[PDB]
Structures are given as structure tokens and as C-alpha cells.
Amino acid sequence: SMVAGSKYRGEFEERLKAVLDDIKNSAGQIITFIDELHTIVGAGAAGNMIKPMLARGELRLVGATTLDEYRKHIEKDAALERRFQQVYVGEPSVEDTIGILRGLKDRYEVHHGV
Amino acid sequence: QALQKYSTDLTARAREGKLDPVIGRDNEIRRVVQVLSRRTKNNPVLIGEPGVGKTAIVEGLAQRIVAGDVPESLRDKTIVALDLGSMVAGSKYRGEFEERLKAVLDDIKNSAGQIITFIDELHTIVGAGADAGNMIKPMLARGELRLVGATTLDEYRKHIEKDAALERRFQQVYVGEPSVEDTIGILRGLKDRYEVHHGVRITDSALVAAATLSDRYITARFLPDKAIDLVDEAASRLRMEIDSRPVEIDEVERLVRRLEIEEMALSKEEDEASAERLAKLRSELADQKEKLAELTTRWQNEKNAKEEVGPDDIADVVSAWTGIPAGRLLEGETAKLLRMEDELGKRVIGQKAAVTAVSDAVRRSRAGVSDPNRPTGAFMFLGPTGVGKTELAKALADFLFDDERAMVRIDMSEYGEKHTVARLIGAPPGYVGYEAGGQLTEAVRRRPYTVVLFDEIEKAHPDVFDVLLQVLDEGRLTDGHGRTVDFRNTILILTSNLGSGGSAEQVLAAVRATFKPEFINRLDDVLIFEGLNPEELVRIVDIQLAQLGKRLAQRRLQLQVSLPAKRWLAQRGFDPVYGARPLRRLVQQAIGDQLAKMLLAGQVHDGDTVPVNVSPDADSL
Amino acid sequence: GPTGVGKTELAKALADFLFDDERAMVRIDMSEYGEKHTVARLIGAPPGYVGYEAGGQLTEAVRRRPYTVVLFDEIEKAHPDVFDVLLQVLDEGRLTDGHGRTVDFRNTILILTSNLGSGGSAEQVLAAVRATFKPEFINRLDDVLIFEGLNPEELVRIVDIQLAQLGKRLAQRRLQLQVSLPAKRWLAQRGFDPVYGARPLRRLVQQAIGDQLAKMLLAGQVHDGDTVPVNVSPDADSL
Amino acid sequence: QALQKYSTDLTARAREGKLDPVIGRDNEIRRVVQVLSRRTKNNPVLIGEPGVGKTAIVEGLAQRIVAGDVPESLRDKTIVALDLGSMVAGSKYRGEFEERLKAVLDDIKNSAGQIITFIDELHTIVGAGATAMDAGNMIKPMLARGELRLVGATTLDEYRKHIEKDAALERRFQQVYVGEPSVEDTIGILRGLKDRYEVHHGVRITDSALVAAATLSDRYITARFLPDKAIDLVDEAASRLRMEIDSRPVEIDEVERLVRRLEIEEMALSKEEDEASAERLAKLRSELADQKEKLAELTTRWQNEKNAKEEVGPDDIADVVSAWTGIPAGRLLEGETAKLLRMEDELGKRVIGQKAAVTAVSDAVRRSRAGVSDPNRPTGAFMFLGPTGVGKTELAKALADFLFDDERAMVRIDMSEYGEKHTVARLIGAPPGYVGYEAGGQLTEAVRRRPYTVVLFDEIEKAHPDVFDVLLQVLDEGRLTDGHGRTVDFRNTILILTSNLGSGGS
Ligand SMILES: Nc1ncnc2c1ncn2[C@@H]1O[C@H](COP(=O)(O)OP(=O)(O)OP(O)(O)=S)[C@@H](O)[C@H]1O
Ligand SMILES: Nc1ncnc2c1ncn2[C@@H]1O[C@H](COP(=O)(O)OP(=O)(O)OP(O)(O)=S)[C@@H](O)[C@H]1O
Ligand SMILES: Nc1ncnc2c1ncn2[C@@H]1O[C@H](COP(=O)(O)OP(=O)(O)OP(O)(O)=S)[C@@H](O)[C@H]1O
Ligand SMILES: Nc1ncnc2c1ncn2[C@@H]1O[C@H](COP(=O)(O)OP(=O)(O)OP(O)(O)=S)[C@@H](O)[C@H]1O
Ligand SMILES: Nc1ncnc2c1ncn2[C@@H]1O[C@H](COP(=O)(O)OP(=O)(O)OP(O)(O)=S)[C@@H](O)[C@H]1O
């Protein structure tokens, strides 16, 4: 949504700077969450006015991506990779899955009529 | 209203009676509905081979919604047909495509789930970018937009399965191809739409044949698709004929016109050689005018005393296609098939036991009696040398195709080592010569009606036999690309030289020593050729002299042979160990050497006739 | 077992009532995998080579619709490295392909037909099997069945099957036959020899009925909507 | 009006009479029409070998539309010939190609089924504009509905390399197979095309010339296909004859330029202060004089011919066929019949004795230029054997000299290195997938170019008794096929096998 109608020469970077300054003005409350963050590599023709903010501890940037796109779009930019602490999420087992289904049953019961 | 700019309306088109009917396929439509009506991730993807009907399922679902045969959770919806090709049309500036796509997605979301988006061939969605077709996963994974798709079975694996985060959000629905008695029902349902476009009548007896024939002859394509084409082309041809005039009168007059045009340019030639080519063109033109007159006179009786596509126009179409003759012996071919061991006897003298067995397999294949899934004939004949076993294979291919260079001939003296099998089956993927296919395979796949001549088969390595083991008895051979090629209309012929004079079993107990029983069991008759008697050589002499005379006509030069010389040649055709090849060299030594010595020392010119006679020992011209 | 006995027929018959379509089984002919490098033909080529997107040939047909019947004809004619892939297909239930995916065979039914020995009474065939295959390969299979051979009594019913099939074939023109019991006995006794199985019977049916029928059929006089009887002469049988 | 930008027009050219005639092929045109006029999926595709005539069928259809020999469904249809190369001309931005294609398709659709498209060489449509797989299959919805008709034509192996790979798009086309015609059909084609060439080159073309072209180029030039390798001969013959009508004829134009060169060399050799070049100079002068003799002779004979060659004949075609693929196919034009009668005494200058073999080789060489020998068999296949030091390799080296004037022009292979079986792969090449595969065979590639040599198998008996089997086809006719699947013809060679069996018994 940030990249839209931004057809002029000084628009997308201006929008991103406005957003980043609005985040930094708040002291430490706002926590940005970028989903599928391997798409921040391009977006310019940019998307790279974030290395400073990451160096200065101002941004929070909790992110989530799949395994292969990580090494295919990020580990080729080891300047970035250092600023990221990885958490590994594994798939559950049958017992944990039964536990999850037991909690989610209520909403599918009410969406349908059964 | 950004949907109206980049989308058609399937439900609107269905309400105006612009879509074709959809017959059957209940399980697939029910699964599509019950996937399309769930809480999260409610978007199916129809997947299958090309031509089995996957756009037809979406169109049938649209018609079903219009009628009102859907559950209450899906009534009064509209099926919009999104079109990504016209959203990328003008998008030079760096936000136009993303903005258009966001506007369309927001238009879909601002509704109340009363819109079903239909992207056809959605393997074309992963690109479109230059971050595009990738800003759709948020809405996809929650069910905000209900996306019915359709791709083939290996554009999926090639483009979408590369993006495993995206293909998590699709629910594959497998669409398999129907059977023959399902295609018949589909054709019965669809008939009334072609009957009106081509103003003719289509017979149920033709609808059955269009599904039966196209299942055994046309193997590179899939069902209903390949059964509607026969009906369509038959109807179109019948309409062309219902217009100005029928066929095989159109050919005759169109040929007589060209013959006359060429005769009216061959008369004004000041040549002595071109004077005899004008004497045959005239004769042929007269013979064609006679046939034209007969057919035109019979057309009048037919018109005074062929208005719907019967089960024979389908066969005519499937025979123009694929070249295979599947007709009913239209009174001009049966007269020729009844005289076959007399047309083969003009080139191969003797060997009636083998001529009366090759021609016996073509009759019971044109008459529709032979097994429909096995080659039309697979038999090995063997005998001594110079007897006529490679000549019968070239004299049979000469009257089925009228050109003896129209047969697939491979010489098995070059298959000495076992790794030469790759020459006729191709190379597996990953190796040097791969995007070229086989050599025997890629030749029987373009014209599946030739005859195949494996020559000198026992000179090969005893593994090419194992490769041939399935071509016989099943008619199928698979190459490196994974294509099955059907040898079900070919006539396989295997010549050999084992025994080489053994009477009956010394030549038969030598086969059983080199070939295995599982190989000798796939064959038809194993025909043993015989030596040449002195009485069946005085006719080979006549054949050789006729060939020589036909070879000399290019020079306007004849020669008259007297019976004493014509039987001197036969008496010096001898040594029943080398067959009839010594006679070919004898004719050269006796006639041709001195003929060509005279022919370039003056003494003989064009138009001359050179009588040959028997000097007390040699021949003199 | 021996030749012409019914071991390739039982696969096409088993796959005909599970899927109701005889062409619904994955069939590969193992007489074409005679070299080492032809293993890449049924597993696919590694990524980045000439034939890459085409994928494997045994793999790509089971990865989708993984409930089929797989047939390996003449398994002994292959190279003793193709057996080293069926090795992991057995006893684990899945193999990997050129990409790296692991398609699973835990629902298929593998069938392997052979002709080893072919003259051994009952033990030479097992000796040839043990000499040609590895013990850790023979160990994983189920019963190594052995077909027996057709008897003069197990052949009259095959005659009946073949005649019914012929009638079904030439019923597209309303041309049913009418066979007599002496005719069937003649056809069953004439072609029997217990070394070539049941293909001599097919060839005899052709040469005895089909030749005369096709000679009479395209010379008029046997027009459609007709039933010709077949009866026995001293030696041949006449229509 | 986008069509006007990215397309030519074929019916207009057929109306202005700029298209060549189209003779025969009624079955193919009728099938093209009846596939072009069906309800859905009306897209034919002509397919075949390169040269048999596929674009000719489409131009014939256009002329037939202009004339009026089409059924009611195809009257006034205005065939259009698309051009995808000019549509990708400048499209470096994100949607410039997509919008052009959309404009063209909408323009074709706005007509009520009048325009008939024609994309020649339609295998170039698969990856039309790429970056992902988006373009070239935007026509895929309109193809199935039958809204654009799209006649197209590709070869037979550029079709399975580019289209059969994409079985979703290969479904929308119907294949029409075009096989090459016979000689009696090529003659009828030539008889109708023999006016445009007669007009372009201001000459006249005899009918025997057409017959001779159609006959000779079917047995001598075996790399190409028929309707075209017969027109090439007539075209080159006519162009040569027109070049000669410019006052000077041939064989005076060469002798003049030769005498000029000899004079320039002799004028520069005179100022050589040596003694070794005083003997070379006294020979170039003799050559110059002996050439001036025949130059003046030809110059005078031309005057007789001119005072006391305006059409192409059946021997100018043979002259072309001899100039290309240097097999001599002429008619023994009196300058070599004397040599061919003297052959035995001319070979007896280098080999002494062995009259029975010299005569047996000379007869086979002689009765091949007189048109008596079998046209499909090698011109001779001899095996002569005897004791050692006798002359059986000297004779083979003298025949090559007599025929080509260079002993190094024959293809000699030494059969004493073919001791083991696997050495056969040396003269036939390796199958697909193995190490030396692009190189092909050695005998095969040596005879495939210059198919008029002498082949010599020295010491045939010292090889393995399985190399003799690969010769059973080369001896009975001229065919031997290499690993690539292409057959070469040995019908113009002389095969010779020397050996030493039974050294000196009897
Ligand atoms: N169940 C069916 N009922 C009626 N017509 C059908 C049915 N299935 C297929 N057809 C027709 O057969 C042809 C098949 O065309 P489609 O179904 O559009 O092919 P497809 O399924 O879209 O495959 P691709 O990959 O898109 S070419 C069309 O003419 C359909 O109208
Ligand atoms: N019965 C025959 N009738 C006519 N010509 C024959 C006959 N037998 C042999 N010939 C001639 O023999 C020559 C070649 O005969 P082929 O049949 O090719 O020899 P073959 O039968 O192949 O034996 P091999 O083992 O292959 S050398 C041709 O010129 C034929 O015309
Ligand atoms: N028990 C049987 N019942 C009916 N037909 C049979 C029987 N056994 C063989 N046949 C016939 O034999 C033919 C096929 O035999 P197959 O079993 O395929 O040969 P096979 O058993 O594979 O032996 P090989 O090694 O392949 S030669 C068909 O015509 C079948 O009808
Ligand atoms: N039936 C015919 N009537 C008249 N001229 C013909 C006929 N068939 C072919 N020709 C001529 O023979 C030549 C064949 O050229 P084309 O048919 O254009 O080649 P092509 O078939 O397109 O092969 P490619 O692969 O496309 S270059 C042309 O000079 C045609 O004019
Ligand atoms: N008839 C001959 N006339 C002239 N020189 C001859 C004659 N026979 C032999 N020679 C000479 O002998 C030399 C060698 O003879 P070759 O013919 O090359 O041997 P060969 O005939 O090949 O016998 P083998 O079995 O190959 S050693 C030639 O180079 C000639 O110089």
C-alpha cells in the first residue's frame, strides 16, 4: 500500500521517511511487524533506509518469513543479517494438534450451523 | 467500479444463454461448492490434463447458480472473471499496477462476500511484477476473496509449486478425463448446438463412432476435446458439399483444367524429345474427361431420383487426420485388394508361401477382423542369399504408399554393441543428445502407417531384441521424453540369413539357438524362403531386361532381344548358392559393357534400336 | 514362470476392477533400462540440466494420485543398479527424485514379472533368481509366486474367452458367429503345445476363422446383419 | 488501426497480382478451408519439412479468396499477416507489449469475424515478451472460442521443440501435414512457374530443361526437398545464360583473364638476376604461347558461330548440378570422350601388367558416364587380391590420380587398426549421450561432403570379422547412417578392397 500512485521522483522515499520519523518520535512504544519481510529488499525501482534505524536501536521490527526465502533474499546482504535474531518454529505433533483443534472447534461450530 | 474495467461477468453471460451446456461431473462441482463455502482459505483450484473439462466445470457452476441449485450460502452471488492481462497493459509509471490491483482488491472486500473471483490459467499470477501477485496472500489466507482457478497438471508444478508459501492457500481438485460412454452422453447433450451452427443434421450413430474411433486412433490428445473435433469437421465438410457441389467431381474438373492448361503450352514446342510427352498427356486428359463425364451423368440421376453426417464422415475425417485408412472399402479399393498376389508377382517371382501370407494380413485388417491393439503384422522371413526377401519388403511398401521410400528402414548391422540401443530410443534427460528424441520413435510418431524393415537382424547384439520385445505383441515403445508411441498400424518385417541352405529344421533349430522363446512367441508366421529353380529365372531375366530398357528410355534408345539370347542369359544364371545376383552382373558384362563402349564411340545415337543376338559363345549387338 | 501363461495378464486384470479402467495403471517396460545412466529417466534429472522441468517418469505419476498399480515388465533385463532404487522403495516406502522431493509409495501395489529359468522344473528357477538378484532384495518382497503352465483342460475355457472377444470385436457390424461344440473341441486340441503357452491359440483362431471371414467379407455375400455358422471339415473348418 | 501498424496484408497483394501461382494441392487447401470454417477451435497449422511448400498453400488460399473459389463462409475475408517482431520493437517499459497485443486483439474482435490472421513461423510465439510466464498466451482464451482464426506454418522439428512442450497451447491447433510431392508433380509445378523467370531474365526456357531439372535434382542433390531444389537449378541456369548474353561467352572469359595473368607474371620475371629463374621463365613463355594459340582459335570460331545458345537446355541444368556437388552429370561433351577411350593406355603409364584388372575398372568407369549403369548402387565395388609387391595399391592410387588429378583426394582408411570389435564406432560415430557425439562419423562425414571420391579399404582381411557386416549396406546400395540419424549416399563412389589371402598358392 505504500507503493501506489507514487509515480513521481520524490514520493516513495518521502513516504517512508515520514513513516520512520513518526515511529521514532514515539519513544519506544511502537513495535513494527513486517510480514514476509523478504519483500523489503526491492520496492525501490530503496527499501534500504532501514540499516541506520536498525543500527541506532530505534526500530523494533519483529518479522516472519519462510526458511528458504530467508537465505535467498537476506543472507545475500550480510550487512542486514547481523541485525536479526532468528527464532526457529517447528511443526507440532499429533497431541499438540489435537490440543489446538480443541480450542479452535468453537469458532467453526458457530460459523456453520453444526 | 474498478472491477468493471478489468473483468467480465460469467453469471451475466450465463443469464443470456451464451454458455454451452455442461453434462455430468457432479462430484467435481459438489467439491468445488463445498470448498468455496468454508470459513478460511476457501478457494479451490481445478487441476488436470488439457482438454478434460475444467473451464466447463466453472461454467456449469455459473449456470447452476443462475438456475438456483446451490445451497443458501451461495445463492445470488456473481462470478466475476478477473483478467490480469489488461491490468498490466499500461503500467509504465512505478505505481500504476499496484494501485490498480489494490483498487480491485478493495472493491472485492467492500462487498459482503457477494463476489467470486475466477482467474483462469493462474500460473500467470506469480509474475506481473517487473512484488506482484504476492500482495494477495493476506486476503487469500483468510477467505476474503473466493478464488476459483484452473491450470494444467504441469504448469502447476512448474510455476506455483516453486512458491510453497503461496500454494498452501489453494485446495487442489483433481479433474480426470472421462470414459467413452461418458463422452457419448456429452456429445448427445452438445449436438443441438452444432446442428444449428452448421445447418445440417447429426446422427446418433455418428455420435457413437466419433467417440469410439477417436479413442484408438488419436492418442496424443484427450477426451471429449478429441471427439468434438470429428463432429465439427464432419459437419463443416457436409455443409461445404451441401453448397455448390460434391467432392470427387471437384477434384476431377480441377485436374482436367490444369491438364488442358499444360497441353495448351506443350503443343507449341519445337522439340523432338518433347513430342512423346505430349502423346501421353493427351491420353491421360481423355481418360480423366471420361471419368468426369460418367460422374456428372450419374449426379443427374442421383439428383432426379447425403444430407446428414453419418458414421462414415467421421471415419473420413479421422483418416484425413493421421493418414490411417479407416473406411469401408469403397468399391475401388476392394477390387485392388482382391488382386494383390498378382500385383506383388510383378516384382517378386516365386515365394508364393510368403506372398500369400503378407497379403493375407492386409485383407483381415481392412475388413475389420484383426485384433485392434497389436501391430497389423509382425513376422520374420529368412532364407538363403539373393532370393528375394528384402525385395518383398520393398515391393509391398511400393503399392500401399505408391512410393517405396516412404517406409522406415533401419539396418541392424550397425547395432553391434549394446549401447547402440540409445540410437533408436533417445537419451535420458541430462545428457548430450536429448532434445532430439529417438530415431525409430520420432519417425513412427509423425506418420503412424508406414512399414518398418529391420534388416539383417541377427547381426545385432542380443539386447536390441529385448528392446523390440514390447513393440511386438503390444505396439508401444517409450522414448526419453516419456512419450508412448504406438506401433499398432505398422507392418513389422525382420529379414535374416540363419541356416543358409539347411533344409527345414537345420534352419529352424538355428533360430531357436539365437532367439529366445519369449521372442519367437511374439511373431506371426516364420516364413522360409526357397531357392530359385531354373524355370523361375527366365522371368527374372524379363524383369531385368524391362528395367534396363526403362533405364535407357531417357536416351530415346531401345533394344530388341531375341529368344536364343534371352534364354542364354537364363542358362548362364547358375550356381544355386548365390541366388539371382549373378544374373545382374551377367547382364552388365554381356550387354552393358559393349553397349557403352559403342555408345560413346559414335556408332549408336538416339532413336536407334540395338538388336542383340547370340554369337556362338557370347552376345553381339 | 514360463512364457504365455498369464503373468502379464493378471496385472491388467487386477488393475481393471480396482479402477474400472484397464489403462489406469503406471506401466514401464524394463527392457529399455539396460544401462547405468538410464536411471535418471525414471527419477528425473538434477536441477540445472537440459531436461529439468519434465521431472521423473515413475515419480511424477505417483506424486499425484498416489493410489495406482505399478508394473515392471521383464525386470531381469535391467541393469543391476535399477534394483538399487526399488531397494529403498521397498522396506521404507518412498524414494527421492531429481529435485529432492520424497514421493511415497505406501499405497501402491508393485508387480514384477520375469522369465528366469523357463525350463527349470521347480528349483532351477529359484537358483537363477538367487544368482541374479541380491538376498537383501529378495528378502523384502512378499511371496515370490510361480506360475505353472496351461493344461489341456485349462484351455477350452480360454478358447471360449477368445471366441467371446472375437464376437465382441466384430459386433460393431451385427456379424455374430455361431460356433459348434466339435468346432470348439477342434480349436482346443489343434493348438496346444506346452512350450509356447496360449499365443498359438490366438494365431490359430486368426488363421482358421479370420482369414476365411475376411476373404468372404469383402467379396460381398456376407453383408451386415447376418450370422454365419462355423463347422468342422475332415481337417479344416468351413464357414 | 493497430493492424495497419503491426501487420501486412496478403489479400491486397493477391489482388495486385504480386503472388506467384499455386499449382496442385487441392486436398491440403480444401482441408485448410474446412478447418478454417468450423464452430470452435478453427485454427489450422501447416506442418512438414523445409521446402515442400507451406507458405505457398496460404498464398494460394489468398488468391482463391480473391478469385471466388471459396464456400459461402469465406467470401471477402481479407487475410492479414501478423508480425510479432515489429510488435516487440520498442517495449522496454512494463506494459508496452501487453497493450499493443491487447489493441491488436480487440481490433480483430471488433470485426464480425472477417479478419483471418496468419502468423508465419508460429513457433516464435511461445515466449513472445517475457521478463514468470505471462505473454504469448493472452491469445489462449480467444483461440478456444474461435474468435481469431490464425493460420500458421512451422517446420516439423521446430514444432516439437517449442510448441509440443506447451500442451495447453498445442491443443488449440489442428495439424495439417504437407508431404513433398513426386517428380511428376514437380514437373507440373515447374511448367506453371516458367513465366516469371522467363520474364525476369530475358531468356527462354525449354520444357526438356524443366524435365531434366526435376529428374536430376532428385538423384544427385540429396540434402533438400523437392519443389525447391528443382527451381534452384532453373534459376541459376537462366541467370548464367543471361550473364553470358553480355557480349562475351564463357570459356573465352576465363582464357582471356588467364593469358592476362600469364603476361603480368612474365613481365615481372624478366628482371630477375639469377640462373634458377632463367629456367622457370623459359617455361612460362611456352605456356603463354600455347594458351594464346587456343585463345585465338576460340576467338575466331566465335566469329563463325556468330556470322554463319539463346535458350536453356537439358545440359545447362547438368552443368549447374556438376558445378554444385561436383559429381559430373553432363553428357560427355567431346573433350573427355577421347580421354575416356584412352583410359586404359593412360593408366598403363603407372601400373605395368594386370590388364585384366585395369580393363575391369575402366569398363565400370566408362559405362557410368554413358548412362548404362544402375542409378542406385555404387559405381563399382571391387576386391582385388594377390601376392605382395604386385601393384594392387598402386592401381588404386593411379585411378584416383586419373580421375581427380590429386592422389590425396581419395578417402583411404587403413583396415589394420580395426582389430577389435569396438573400433567400428570410429567410422559410424557414437550414439546419443556418449563422449564423442557431435563429431559424428569419420567415413560418413568424409563422404557427406564431396560425394565423388574413391574409397580404399587397405588390408581388409586383418580386421575383425564384424567390420565386414557394416559394409553389407554400403556395397549393395549407397546408404550408411551415423549416430545423428542422417543417411549418406555412396552411389557415386568407387569402393576398392585390397587383401592378401592365400599368399601365393594358385
Ligand atoms: N462436462 C462437459 N460437458 C459439456 N461439454 C464439455 C464438458 N467437458 C468438456 N466439454 C467441452 O469440451 C471442450 C473442452 O474445453 P475446455 O473444458 O475449455 O478445456 P479446458 O478444460 O479448459 O482445458 P484447458 O487446459 O483450459 S485447454 C469444450 O468445447 C467444452 O465445451
Ligand atoms: N524372386 C525374385 N524376383 C525378382 N527379383 C529377385 C528375386 N530374388 C532376387 N531378386 C533380385 O535380387 C536383387 C536383390 O535381392 P535381395 O532380396 O535384396 O537379396 P536378399 O533376399 O536380401 O538376400 P540377402 O541375404 O539380404 S543378401 C534384386 O536385383 C532383385 O531384383
Ligand atoms: N490364464 C490365462 N487366461 C486367459 N488368457 C490367457 C491366460 N494366459 C495367457 N493368456 C493369453 O496370453 C496372452 C498374453 O500372455 P501373457 O501372460 O501376457 O504372456 P506372459 O505371461 O507375460 O509371458 P511372457 O514372458 O510375457 S512371453 C493374451 O492373449 C492372453 O489372453
Ligand atoms: N504448389 C506450388 N505451386 C507453385 N509454387 C510452389 C508450390 N509449392 C512450392 N512452390 C514454390 O517452391 C518454393 C517453396 O517455398 P516456400 O513454400 O515458401 O517454402 P516453405 O514451405 O515456407 O519452407 P520454409 O521452412 O517456411 S522457408 C517457393 O518458390 C514456392 O513458390
Ligand atoms: N605393376 C607395377 N608397375 C609399376 N610399379 C609397380 C608395379 N607393381 C609394384 N610396383 C611398385 O611397387 C611399389 C609397392 O607396391 P604396392 O602395390 O604398393 O604393394 P601392394 O601391391 O600393396 O602389395 P601389399 O600386399 O600391399 S605389400 C609401388 O609403389 C611401385 O613403385
Short mmCIF file of N, CA, C and O in Angstrom, two decimals, chain B residues 378-380 412 454 457 462-473 492 494 511 514-524 526, chain C residues 3 74 77 115 196 199 203:
data_model
loop_
_atom_site.label_atom_id
_atom_site.label_comp_id
_atom_site.label_asym_id
_atom_site.label_seq_id
_atom_site.Cartn_x
_atom_site.Cartn_y
_atom_site.Cartn_z
N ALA B 378 3.47 -58.81 -37.67
CA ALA B 378 4.84 -58.82 -37.17
C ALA B 378 5.40 -60.22 -37.40
O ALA B 378 5.23 -61.10 -36.56
N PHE B 379 6.06 -60.41 -38.53
CA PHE B 379 6.56 -61.72 -38.92
C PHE B 379 7.95 -61.62 -39.53
O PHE B 379 8.28 -60.64 -40.20
N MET B 380 8.74 -62.65 -39.29
CA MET B 380 10.13 -62.73 -39.73
C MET B 380 10.26 -63.79 -40.82
O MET B 380 9.90 -64.94 -40.59
N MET B 412 20.38 -53.27 -39.17
CA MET B 412 20.82 -53.78 -37.88
C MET B 412 22.22 -54.36 -37.91
O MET B 412 22.62 -55.03 -36.95
N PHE B 454 13.40 -54.11 -40.31
CA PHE B 454 14.62 -54.42 -39.57
C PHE B 454 15.42 -55.40 -40.42
O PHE B 454 15.05 -56.57 -40.55
N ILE B 457 18.82 -58.82 -39.04
CA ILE B 457 18.57 -58.66 -37.61
C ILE B 457 19.49 -59.50 -36.73
O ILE B 457 19.77 -59.10 -35.60
N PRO B 462 22.38 -59.25 -28.84
CA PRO B 462 21.14 -59.84 -28.34
C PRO B 462 20.53 -59.07 -27.18
O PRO B 462 20.13 -59.66 -26.17
N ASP B 463 20.42 -57.76 -27.33
CA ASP B 463 19.68 -56.89 -26.42
C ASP B 463 18.75 -55.95 -27.16
O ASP B 463 17.71 -55.55 -26.62
N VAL B 464 19.09 -55.60 -28.40
CA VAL B 464 18.15 -54.88 -29.25
C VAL B 464 16.90 -55.72 -29.46
O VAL B 464 15.80 -55.18 -29.65
N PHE B 465 17.03 -57.04 -29.41
CA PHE B 465 15.86 -57.90 -29.44
C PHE B 465 14.97 -57.62 -28.23
O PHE B 465 13.75 -57.45 -28.36
N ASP B 466 15.57 -57.55 -27.04
CA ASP B 466 14.80 -57.22 -25.85
C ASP B 466 14.15 -55.85 -25.96
O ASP B 466 13.06 -55.65 -25.42
N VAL B 467 14.80 -54.90 -26.63
CA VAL B 467 14.14 -53.61 -26.83
C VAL B 467 12.95 -53.76 -27.77
O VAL B 467 11.93 -53.09 -27.61
N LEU B 468 13.07 -54.64 -28.77
CA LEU B 468 11.97 -54.92 -29.68
C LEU B 468 10.90 -55.79 -29.04
O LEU B 468 9.88 -56.05 -29.68
N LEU B 469 11.12 -56.25 -27.82
CA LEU B 469 10.27 -57.29 -27.25
C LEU B 469 8.85 -56.79 -27.00
O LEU B 469 7.89 -57.56 -27.06
N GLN B 470 8.70 -55.50 -26.71
CA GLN B 470 7.38 -54.92 -26.46
C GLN B 470 6.75 -54.29 -27.70
O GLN B 470 5.53 -54.17 -27.75
N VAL B 471 7.56 -53.88 -28.68
CA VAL B 471 7.00 -53.37 -29.92
C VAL B 471 6.11 -54.41 -30.57
O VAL B 471 5.00 -54.12 -31.02
N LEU B 472 6.59 -55.65 -30.65
CA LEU B 472 5.73 -56.77 -30.99
C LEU B 472 4.81 -57.08 -29.83
O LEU B 472 5.13 -56.83 -28.66
N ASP B 473 3.62 -57.58 -30.16
CA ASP B 473 2.66 -58.12 -29.19
C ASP B 473 1.98 -57.06 -28.34
O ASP B 473 0.99 -57.35 -27.66
N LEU B 492 5.55 -54.82 -39.25
CA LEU B 492 6.94 -55.08 -38.94
C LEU B 492 7.46 -56.27 -39.74
O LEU B 492 6.77 -57.28 -39.90
N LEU B 494 11.16 -58.57 -40.37
CA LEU B 494 12.50 -58.89 -39.90
C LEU B 494 13.11 -59.91 -40.84
O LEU B 494 12.68 -61.07 -40.86
N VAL B 511 17.40 -70.69 -35.52
CA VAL B 511 16.61 -69.65 -34.88
C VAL B 511 16.54 -69.91 -33.38
O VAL B 511 16.98 -69.10 -32.57
N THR B 514 19.59 -68.74 -31.39
CA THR B 514 19.96 -67.35 -31.21
C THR B 514 18.85 -66.50 -30.59
O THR B 514 19.15 -65.61 -29.79
N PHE B 515 17.60 -66.76 -30.94
CA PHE B 515 16.47 -66.04 -30.36
C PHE B 515 15.89 -66.84 -29.20
O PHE B 515 15.99 -68.07 -29.19
N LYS B 516 15.29 -66.15 -28.24
CA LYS B 516 14.71 -66.78 -27.08
C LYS B 516 13.26 -67.16 -27.34
O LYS B 516 12.63 -66.64 -28.27
N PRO B 517 12.69 -68.07 -26.54
CA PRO B 517 11.29 -68.47 -26.79
C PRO B 517 10.31 -67.34 -26.61
O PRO B 517 9.34 -67.23 -27.38
N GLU B 518 10.52 -66.49 -25.60
CA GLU B 518 9.66 -65.33 -25.42
C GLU B 518 9.70 -64.38 -26.61
O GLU B 518 8.78 -63.57 -26.76
N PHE B 519 10.74 -64.44 -27.44
CA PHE B 519 10.81 -63.66 -28.66
C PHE B 519 10.21 -64.38 -29.86
O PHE B 519 9.50 -63.75 -30.64
N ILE B 520 10.48 -65.67 -30.02
CA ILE B 520 9.86 -66.42 -31.10
C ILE B 520 8.37 -66.60 -30.89
O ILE B 520 7.66 -67.04 -31.81
N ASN B 521 7.86 -66.27 -29.71
CA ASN B 521 6.44 -66.42 -29.44
C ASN B 521 5.64 -65.19 -29.81
O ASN B 521 4.43 -65.29 -30.01
N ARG B 522 6.28 -64.02 -29.90
CA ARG B 522 5.57 -62.81 -30.27
C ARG B 522 5.31 -62.73 -31.77
O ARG B 522 4.52 -61.89 -32.21
N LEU B 523 5.96 -63.57 -32.56
CA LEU B 523 5.91 -63.43 -34.00
C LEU B 523 4.69 -64.12 -34.60
O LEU B 523 4.13 -65.06 -34.03
N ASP B 524 4.30 -63.65 -35.77
CA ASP B 524 3.43 -64.40 -36.66
C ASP B 524 4.29 -65.42 -37.40
O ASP B 524 5.39 -65.75 -36.96
N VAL B 526 6.82 -67.64 -39.33
CA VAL B 526 8.23 -67.53 -39.66
C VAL B 526 8.39 -68.15 -41.05
O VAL B 526 8.44 -69.37 -41.19
N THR C 3 6.57 -68.95 -20.55
CA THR C 3 6.06 -67.92 -21.44
C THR C 3 4.61 -68.20 -21.83
O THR C 3 4.20 -69.35 -21.99
N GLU C 74 9.60 -57.59 -17.36
CA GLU C 74 10.94 -58.11 -17.60
C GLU C 74 11.98 -57.37 -16.76
O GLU C 74 12.86 -56.68 -17.27
N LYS C 77 15.87 -57.87 -17.32
CA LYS C 77 16.58 -57.25 -18.43
C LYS C 77 17.19 -55.91 -18.08
O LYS C 77 17.85 -55.31 -18.93
N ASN C 115 10.99 -64.01 -16.51
CA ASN C 115 11.01 -65.28 -17.23
C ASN C 115 12.28 -66.06 -16.91
O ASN C 115 12.80 -66.79 -17.76
N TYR C 196 4.81 -73.00 -25.69
CA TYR C 196 4.57 -71.64 -26.14
C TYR C 196 3.33 -71.02 -25.52
O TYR C 196 2.89 -69.96 -25.97
N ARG C 199 -0.52 -68.28 -26.86
CA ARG C 199 -0.47 -67.46 -28.06
C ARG C 199 -0.66 -68.27 -29.34
O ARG C 199 -1.23 -67.76 -30.31
N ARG C 203 -3.09 -67.28 -32.61
CA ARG C 203 -2.69 -67.34 -34.01
C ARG C 203 -3.53 -68.35 -34.78
O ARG C 203 -3.85 -68.13 -35.96
#
